Design a protein around this ligand. Sequence first.
Ligand SMILES: *[C@@H]1O[C@H](CO)[C@@H](O)[C@H](O)[C@H]1NC(C)=O
Ligand SMILES: *[C@@H]1O[C@H](CO)[C@@H](O)[C@H](O)[C@H]1NC(C)=O
Length: 272
Amino acid sequence: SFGRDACSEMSIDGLCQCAPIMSEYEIICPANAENPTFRLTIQPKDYVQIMCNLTDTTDYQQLPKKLRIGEVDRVQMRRCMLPGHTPIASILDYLGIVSPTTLIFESDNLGMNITRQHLDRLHGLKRFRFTTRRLTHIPANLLTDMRNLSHLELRANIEEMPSHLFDDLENLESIEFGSNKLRQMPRGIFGKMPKLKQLNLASNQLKSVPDGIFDRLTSLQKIWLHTNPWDCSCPRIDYLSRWLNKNSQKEQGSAKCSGSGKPVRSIICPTT
Ligand SMILES: *[C@@H]1O[C@H](CO)[C@@H](O)[C@H](O)[C@H]1NC(C)=O
Ligand SMILES: *[C@@H]1O[C@H](CO)[C@@H](O)[C@H](O)[C@H]1NC(C)=O
């Protein structure tokens, strides 16, 4: 585990400087640099933040060596690059970060397309947040083996969602897919979700949803569908209008119609 003694040792060799600030530790890599490659914030056994400023993936050599942070709950990686075709878990391993419950990877400088390999050796993760302003295509295998995952947030201007994205992810409790550019939803995307309580599909580009999309969401408590250009023509909006009327208590905010602006829940489709 990383402490005051481990922090003191770093300020002798000169590779990286450590400073005991408040109840945590601020690590600057390289030490004495105006614009450091790494800015680490370590609050022992609780939280570890990695503030990056890399021109290329090669700069990961500037990371503190022989560092043994140990067990940490939350890991926040801001502006960091994917270490090529190597898992993000390697950066965690190099720093001695053991069994993280949460991982937040926010970066507009990824350098490449996020693959299943970047998320490898992270099957024990409970919470995962991946944010990028850049146009990102998500593969179907990306979240495989992430079976212990209960919270997932993906804000990446994603246009299409692969159908087998949540294949063998039954422990999921919360999904945040807000402020993406999603036009569609696959038919059996939320098939095996017996533990999902919260689902956020707001601020997307959804005109419709396939019939029965939320029927297998038995544990659902909250749902966000607002700020979507919902096509409220019948019989297309029937399932969603009926579902949002029956599960009005679950709806957070109000999903409105493209033309009128009337809540989707207030639309009553006829039978023909
Ligand atoms: C990142 O590093 C470059 C030099 O490579 C520097 O010009 C820039 O100001 C740095 N940015 C931040 C936010 O530190
Ligand atoms: C990611 O992959 C897609 C094809 O699946 C490609 O069109 C896109 O340009 C790639 N992204 C980057 C940043 O190269």
